[PDB]
Design a protein around this ligand. Structure first.
Ligand code: HEM
Length: 390
């Protein structure tokens, strides 16, 4: 039998994803079990310092996502790697996604003229209780992998190799519950959040490139800057869950507020999770309440298909509040080709929803995910630099 401190066995340690591609990974990539979002301040003095930060991030993310033996150096020097994952780094399904904030487009690096048209500093919503220390940032990194230790090891590599260029503003890790393999012929399910409901059922088809080019990815023919093609707006919201009050809530109230059955994830007029409700035949809200979460987030009209988003959240759990209740909730992360048409328009409709009785957004921010690195001569943010050079 294994000794107490012997490491747990994993067969997913060589899971991997391409770093290069037209898009950055970690958006349409299948979401792994561990997630982490770190927001930084860019300490770069000029554009050359920003270029060094970009090319360094490109080199570090490429190796971290590929894995391999870490070179050994003179013992008088610090180790090249933290060693959390051993002498040979394992990918372990890791993806690191880079996004730039609105504050980066100030007078510091001359990028003000090429800012994405809908990239703004996040403004608080009526139900928000935002903490300024956990809001905004020059740059955001999204770490997703099979384990939090792979994520934390990836964070340690970034901060070690960029000590004078990156200052960590705020961070929030999270996870989703894995499930047993689906039996043949039975459709798989979305992961459940800390409210007990399946999260992401009505997400657009990530296998439909036309749908992704319509909802998620900035297209070159749009009114956005030319460099921003194949990027995406990233919205982050740390939303608290008042789980004790929610667990005391009757089941029928839970389902009538969200708009879906808890067990099956089905719509109020359907039977399976993959089904969508028919609002036109229910104009008064007898089946699905007019203030349901999914009904408010998606009226499913023709005028609302421009407000669809790709949600990619995690469930977070921190300490315990002094009042006695647990600080846990949803690490909300969603992507959209248009931030104003996407998250901003949807959250506006959700304002005042009966779900707000159990929600409390306390932080997050808006960022624009840079386009993907296409080849060995491209790097993270090169298109942004070249489009703004005098
Ligand atoms: C804070 C910003 C949020 C936005 C913009 C948002 C948006 C959406 C959207 C667009 C849908 C799809 C509805 C449809 O297409 O029919 C949805 C569904 C859903 N949301 Fe949210 N949501 C947010 C927060 C939350 C939170 C905090 C929770 C729970 C703690 C939650 C739980 C759910 C559930 C259970 C569903 C049904 C399953 C699904 O289709 O994903 N949402 N939401």
């Amino acid at each position: 039998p294994a000794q107490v401190t012997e490491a747990p066995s994993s067969d997913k340690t060589q899971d991997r994803h391409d770093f290069h591609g037209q898009h950055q990974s970690g958006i349409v990539t299948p979401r792994p079990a561990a997630g982490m979002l770190v927001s930084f301040d860019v300490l770069a003095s000029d554009r050359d310092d920003l270029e060094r930060l970009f090319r360094t991030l490109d080199q570090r993310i490429a190796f971290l996502m590929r894995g391999g033996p870490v070179a050994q150096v003179d013992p008088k020097l610090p180790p090249l790697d933290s060693g959390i994952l051993g002498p040979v780094v394992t990918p372990d399904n890791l993806t690191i996604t880079v996004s730039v904030g609105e504050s980066l487009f100030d007078e510091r690096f001359g990028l003000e003229a090429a800012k994405p048209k809908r990239l703004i500093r996040m403004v608080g919503f009526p139900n928000d209780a935002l903490e300024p220390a956990c809001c905004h940032g020059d740059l955001s990194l999204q770490f997703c992998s099979n384990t939090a230790d792979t994520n934390i090891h990836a964070l340690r590599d970034i901060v070690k190799n960029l000590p004078d260029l990156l200052l960590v503003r705020w961070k929030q890790e999270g996870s989703v519950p894995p499930q047993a393999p689906a039996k043949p012929g039975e459709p798989a399910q979305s992961a459940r959040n800390f409210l007990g409901f399946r999260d992401g059922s009505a997400n657009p088809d990530s296998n439909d490139p036309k749908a992704m080019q319509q909802i998620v990815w900035v297209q070159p023919g749009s009114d956005e800057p030319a460099w921003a093609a194949h990027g995406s707006y990233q919205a982050v919201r740390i939303i608290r869950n008042f789980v004790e009050r929610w667990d005391r809530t009757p089941l029928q109230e839970q389902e009538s507020i969200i708009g879906r059955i808890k067990t099956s994830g089905a719509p109020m007029d359907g039977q399976k999770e993959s089904q969508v409700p028919d609002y036109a035949r229910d104009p008064h809200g007898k089946v699905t309440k007019l203030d349901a979460h999914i009904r408010l987030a998606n009226p499913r009209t023709a005028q609302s298909q421009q407000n669809l988003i790709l949600r990619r959240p995690f469930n977070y759990s921190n300490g315990v509040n002094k009042n006695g209740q647990l600080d846990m909730g949803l690490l909300f992360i969603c992507y959209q080709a248009d931030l104003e048409k996407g998250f901003i328009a949807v959250q506006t409709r959700l304002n005042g929803e009966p779900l707000e009785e159990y929600l409390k957004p306390t932080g997050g921010g808006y960022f624009f995910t840079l386009p993907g690195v296409t080849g060995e001569e491209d790097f993270i943010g090169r298109s942004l630099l070249d489009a703004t050079r005098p």
